Amino acid sequence: FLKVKNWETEVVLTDTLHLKSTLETGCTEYICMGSIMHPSQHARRPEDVATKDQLFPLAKEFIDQYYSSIKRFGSKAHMERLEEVNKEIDTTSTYQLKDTELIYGAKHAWRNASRCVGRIQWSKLQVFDARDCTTAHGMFNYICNHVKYATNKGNLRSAITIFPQRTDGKHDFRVWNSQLIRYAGYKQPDGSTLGDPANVQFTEICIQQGWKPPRGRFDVLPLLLQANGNDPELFQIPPELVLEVPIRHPKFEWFKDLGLKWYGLPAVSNMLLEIGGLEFSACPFSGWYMGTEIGVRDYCDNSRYNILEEVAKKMNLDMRKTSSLWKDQALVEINIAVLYSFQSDKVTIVDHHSATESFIKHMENEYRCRGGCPADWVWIVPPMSGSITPVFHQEMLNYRLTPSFEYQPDPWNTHVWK
Amino acid sequence: RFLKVKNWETEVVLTDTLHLKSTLETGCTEYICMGSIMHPSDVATKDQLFPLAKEFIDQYYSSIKRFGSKAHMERLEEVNKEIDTTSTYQLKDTELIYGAKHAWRNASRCVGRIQWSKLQVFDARDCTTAHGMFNYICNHVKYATNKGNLRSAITIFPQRTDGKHDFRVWNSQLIRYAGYKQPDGSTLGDPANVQFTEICIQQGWKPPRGRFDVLPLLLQANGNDPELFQIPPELVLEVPIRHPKFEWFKDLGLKWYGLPAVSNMLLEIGGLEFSACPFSGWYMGTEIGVRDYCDNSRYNILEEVAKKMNLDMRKTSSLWKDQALVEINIAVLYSFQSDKVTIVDHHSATESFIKHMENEYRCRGGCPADWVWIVPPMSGSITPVFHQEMLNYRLTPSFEYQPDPWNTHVWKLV
Numbered sequence: 001f002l003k004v005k006n007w008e009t010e011v012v013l014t015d016t017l018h019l020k021s022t023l024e025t026g027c028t029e030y031i032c033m034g035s036i037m038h039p040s041q042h043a044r045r046p047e048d049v050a051t052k053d054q055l056f057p058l059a060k061e062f063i064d065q066y067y068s069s070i071k072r073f074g075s076k077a078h079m080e081r082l083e084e085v086n087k088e089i090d091t092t093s094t095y096q097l098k099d100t101e102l103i104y105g106a107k108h109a110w111r112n113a114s115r116c117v118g119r120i121q122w123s124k125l126q127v128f129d130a131r132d133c134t135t136a137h138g139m140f141n142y143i144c145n146h147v148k149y150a151t152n153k154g155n156l157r158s159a160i161t162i163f164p165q166r167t168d169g170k171h172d173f174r175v176w177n178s179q180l181i182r183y184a185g186y187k188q189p190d191g192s193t194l195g196d197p198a199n200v201q202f203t204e205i206c207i208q209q210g211w212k213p214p215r216g217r218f219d220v221l222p223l224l225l226q227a228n229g230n231d232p233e234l235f236q237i238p239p240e241l242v243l244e245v246p247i248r249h250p251k252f253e254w255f256k257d258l259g260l261k262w263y264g265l266p267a268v269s270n271m272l273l274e275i276g277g278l279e280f281s282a283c284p285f286s287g288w289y290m291g292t293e294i295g296v297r298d299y300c301d302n303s304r305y306n307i308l309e310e311v312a313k314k315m316n317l318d319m320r321k322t323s324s325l326w327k328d329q330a331l332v333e334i335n336i337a338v339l340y341s342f343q344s345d346k347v348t349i350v351d352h353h354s355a356t357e358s359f360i361k362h363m364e365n366e367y368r369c370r371g372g373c374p375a376d377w378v379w380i381v382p383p384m385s386g387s388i389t390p391v392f393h394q395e396m397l398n399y400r401l402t403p404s405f406e407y408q409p410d411p412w413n414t415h416v417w418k
Numbered sequence: 419r420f421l422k423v424k425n426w427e428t429e430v431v432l433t434d435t436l437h438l439k440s441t442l443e444t445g446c447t448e449y450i451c452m453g454s455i456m457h458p459s460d461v462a463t464k465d466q467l468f469p470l471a472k473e474f475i476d477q478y479y480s481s482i483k484r485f486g487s488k489a490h491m492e493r494l495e496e497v498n499k500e501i502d503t504t505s506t507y508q509l510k511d512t513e514l515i516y517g518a519k520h521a522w523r524n525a526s527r528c529v530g531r532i533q534w535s536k537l538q539v540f541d542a543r544d545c546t547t548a549h550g551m552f553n554y555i556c557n558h559v560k561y562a563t564n565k566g567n568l569r570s571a572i573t574i575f576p577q578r579t580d581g582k583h584d585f586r587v588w589n590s591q592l593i594r595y596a597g598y599k600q601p602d603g604s605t606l607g608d609p610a611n612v613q614f615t616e617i618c619i620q621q622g623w624k625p626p627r628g629r630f631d632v633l634p635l636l637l638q639a640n641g642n643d644p645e646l647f648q649i650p651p652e653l654v655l656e657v658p659i660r661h662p663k664f665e666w667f668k669d670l671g672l673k674w675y676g677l678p679a680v681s682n683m684l685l686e687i688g689g690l691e692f693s694a695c696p697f698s699g700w701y702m703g704t705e706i707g708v709r710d711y712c713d714n715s716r717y718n719i720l721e722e723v724a725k726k727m728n729l730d731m732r733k734t735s736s737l738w739k740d741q742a743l744v745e746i747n748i749a750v751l752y753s754f755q756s757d758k759v760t761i762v763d764h765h766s767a768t769e770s771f772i773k774h775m776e777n778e779y780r781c782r783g784g785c786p787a788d789w790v791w792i793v794p795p796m797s798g799s800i801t802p803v804f805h806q807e808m809l810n811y812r813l814t815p816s817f818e819y820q821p822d823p824w825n826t827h828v829w830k831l832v
């Protein structure tokens with residue numbers, strides 16, 4: 001038993017789910033790594049094609065969990081499934097998931113994502129099975145359909161598209177983009193950066209692959225898609241599938257003249273989805289934005305669009321010294337405008353007040369039915385106004401449950417070109 | 419072994435070797451992280467005390483470039499003699515100063531540690547009565563306050579002996595405001611202090627029953643019942659809160675005290691436990707403007723400020739709370755600066771902490787830091803500490819939590 005307390009409400013929750021955790025957190029009895037971005041390299045199967053004694057135990061554990069979930073365990077179909085997975089590994093060194101197991105696995109990987117404040121939605125996830133894909137052209141078709149379904153004319157819907165699992169490690173499917181939709185970044189001759197500085201390296205790869213850059217501040221990047229280990233290929237997402245929101249402010253009429261915009265669909269495409277020892281290296285997933293992601297991090301991080309100085313000037317703030325809080329003051333106005341703009345255009349978005357409140361309710365739900373909820377305080381607390389949200393005052397336990405979403409190397413560090 | 423921490427804004431990478439010197443638990447295990455748990459959870463024997471004392475004396479003599487010296491070996495022998503004959507020992511004044519400074523240096527939740535080596539240590543180990551403690555604390559407040567040019571200080575009372583004769587300051591800080599629950603369920607003053615205010619009233623304090631009554635000192639010497647004392651009002655420096663642009667702000671009637679002075683923690687040096695050790699620095703603005711004023715369970719002023727600001731309070735997505743929070747914190751900094759009372763804003767403070775952290779990795783091999791506490795409670799990611807990976811571990815000497823004394827004290831009168 002482990003208790004967590006909320007210091008605002010004095011609610012105490014009791015955690016037993018942590019007894020099912022599989023991987024190391026990175027912490028020990030003597031050192032806490034809770035603010036390390038990648039604290040652990042502990043993996044459930046070695047790098048390349050596992051032996052039978054390595055894969056089968058992980059498969060059995062997942063199948064046991066799935067059949068437990070549906071009030072079976074030991075049933076006819078469970079034992080036959082075990083035997084089927086046994087023969088499949090014996091004869092191919094891997095196995096294939098049933099459609100139901102795949103959906104269960106994807107939803108539970110989201111459910112287990114301790115860094116995600118959005119998980120009250122976890123069981124309402126649309127799963128697109130793309131395991132029949134064979135070429136980068138087919139990957140583009142599956143991704144276009146995902147983007148169109150998920151955008152839904154602004155009434156955003158959570159979705160995941162799952163490409164063929166890893167086999168030997170030389171035939172990986174990868175989306176090289178970090179998100180399906182991001183803006184290019186360009187190193188300028190004088191030394192500054194145009195567009196998104198985070199994407200300068202990826203933009204250079206695209207240009208080096210023949211992309212013709214319009215060289216603006218908000219150029220939607222092409223897709224760079226890799227199927228079955230082959231060299232990646234460039235595709236332009238049809239712009240009518242890319243919903244964008246011009247940013248304006250409900251009081252500052254000059255705000256629109258800053259020429260800011262963002263895209264509506266946050267779609268992570270560089271993570272790995274691990275189910276029963278199987279590794280799905282291409283599994284783009286998408287939901288909808290919390291405003292602080294755009295307003296605080298994308299726009300105001302020093303190494304991103306870094307717009308605080310420009311907004312503060314227009315606001316006529318005292319920028320001589322930090323103690324005028326001119327940065328904090330512009331920061332609020334920017335986040336007001338982001339929310340106001342998405343809402344004006346009827347594009348789904350949630351503010352950090354509503355999102356964090358939903359997550360406290362999700363925590364309570366999970367402790368009641370599941371006996372726990374893994375949660376990473378460092379990621380869950382929003383990057384502005386921390387303590388006036390309820391999650392700031394909520395103790396959380398962090399542990400690693402499977403199925404899960406994991407980080408993986410960027411493909412340009414590992415891909416041997418042809 | 420080595421551990422690396424990266425800053426994701428600057429890509430600077432630092433290498434921690436100092437974590438190898440910890441030997442106290444964090445509360446985390448290899449499969450669970452408890453990094454957001456507030457408190458992750460009676461006197462040492464001779465055998466327990468020997469190695470704790472040795473480790474501390476060894477690190478003192480190493481710090482002063484005399485490890486292995488004749489003075490080092492004789493001090494070790496002398497300490498062992500005391501433990502053997504008295505079951506405890508006494509620190510030299512130099513060791514006490516060194517221990518107190520390093521407890522601060524090791525405080526993983528404190529963002530102000532760039533200042534750690536400039537700490538004025540008042541030795542109060544000869545004190546025997548609550549009247550004596552009051553005198554020592556008055557002198558601490560006056561020295562630390564310094565007419566608004568604040569100076570860090572700590573006053574250290576006699577160490578624990580058998581656990582039945584503890585010195586304790588029952589206040590959680592030296593200066594705080596009273597809280598009174600009303601019959602209708604409202605609270606007047608600071609709701610955090612309702613319980614301690616009740617104890618004071620029960621002990622004979624006559625409260626003014628206003629919004630900002632400075633509480634009396636409740637002081638316990640040698641395990642006796644605690645005794646009430648009024649800090650002389652001319653030693654309690656306060657700042658009335660006004661705003662540089664909203665002339666109505668002063669009409670909220672807000673004020674705060676200038677000296678933050680924690681008095682309920684325990685200072686452990688070489689196995690010795692100093693249960694009464696009040697220490698003081700100066701404020702970071704968000705402590706007052708964000709937590710004291712805008713926590714829902716504290717003075718909770720967001721509503722009244724936003725109303726006078728004429729904000730739309732119907733929807734959360736108007737971010738009226740966020741907008742009013744910023745203005746309150748502007749007022750707090752402007753007020754202190756105008757009255758020439760030392761204060762630091764969260765931007766300046768976090769920037770200095772990054773510089774201190776880098777220096778500590780260079781000269782010491784690391785810097786234990788609690789990201790959950792170091793990142794300020796507003797505007798988190800526009801400060802540099804948000805982007806800084808940190809390792810948290812427990813080094814000694816250290817400041818430790820201890821039970822509230824009213825939960826363990828057994829009373830003697832009537």
Ligand code: HEM
Pocket residue numbers: 110113115116117118119121125158159160285286287288289290293350355379405
């Ligand atoms: C439905 C609305 C959703 C909201 C509002 C939401 C909110 C968030 C936010 C604010 C973050 C932090 C992002 C960052 O700082 O980079 C995050 C992270 C994450 N989300 Fe969610 N999310 C949603 C849906 C989803 C879905 C559908 C999935 C997967 C099926 C998912 C899986 C994750 C994962 C794995 C992370 C961690 C990313 C990392 O470690 O880099 N989320 N989410």
Ligand code: HEM
Pocket residue numbers: 518522525527528529530531533537570571572697698699700701702705762767791817
């Ligand atoms: C000199 C200026 C100082 C500044 C600006 C400063 C800043 C801070 C802040 C903002 C906190 C967090 C407070 C909270 O959120 O409750 C803190 C905590 C702390 N400070 Fe410092 N501090 C200073 C001096 C000191 C000194 C002189 C000591 C001891 C000698 C000290 C030891 C601590 C400890 C032990 C904590 C953790 C308290 C807890 O866990 O409740 N600090 N400091």
Ligand SMILES: CNCc1cccc(-c2cc(C)cc(N)n2)c1
Pocket residue numbers: 118179266267268285286287288289290293
């Ligand atoms: C490496 N950062 C991960 C990352 C970066 C950018 C956006 C997200 C995100 C993802 C989803 C599904 C919903 C949401 N509101 N935001 C996640």
Ligand SMILES: CNCc1cccc(-c2cc(C)cc(N)n2)c1
Pocket residue numbers: 591678679680697698699700701702705
């Ligand atoms: C329960 N938190 C402890 C606490 C509560 C209130 C204030 C502080 C503090 C202490 C010092 C020395 C400097 C500073 N700026 N603030 C610490």
Ligand SMILES: C[C@H](O)[C@H](O)[C@H]1CNc2nc(N)[nH]c(=O)c2N1
Pocket residue numbers: 035036037378379380426804805806807808
């Ligand atoms: C060092 C620190 O862990 C890092 O900056 C983290 C802090 N918390 C975060 N929280 C979220 N949601 N997203 C992030 O990218 C980060 N970055």
Ligand SMILES: C[C@H](O)[C@H](O)[C@H]1CNc2nc(N)[nH]c(=O)c2N1
Pocket residue numbers: 007392393394395396453454455456790791792
């Ligand atoms: C639950 C959580 O650990 C708790 O609210 C912490 C968060 N970080 C904090 N950080 C500081 N400086 N002070 C605090 O009181 C807290 N409270």
Ligand SMILES: [Zn+2]
Pocket residue numbers: 027031032033034446450451452453
């Ligand atoms: Zn930890």
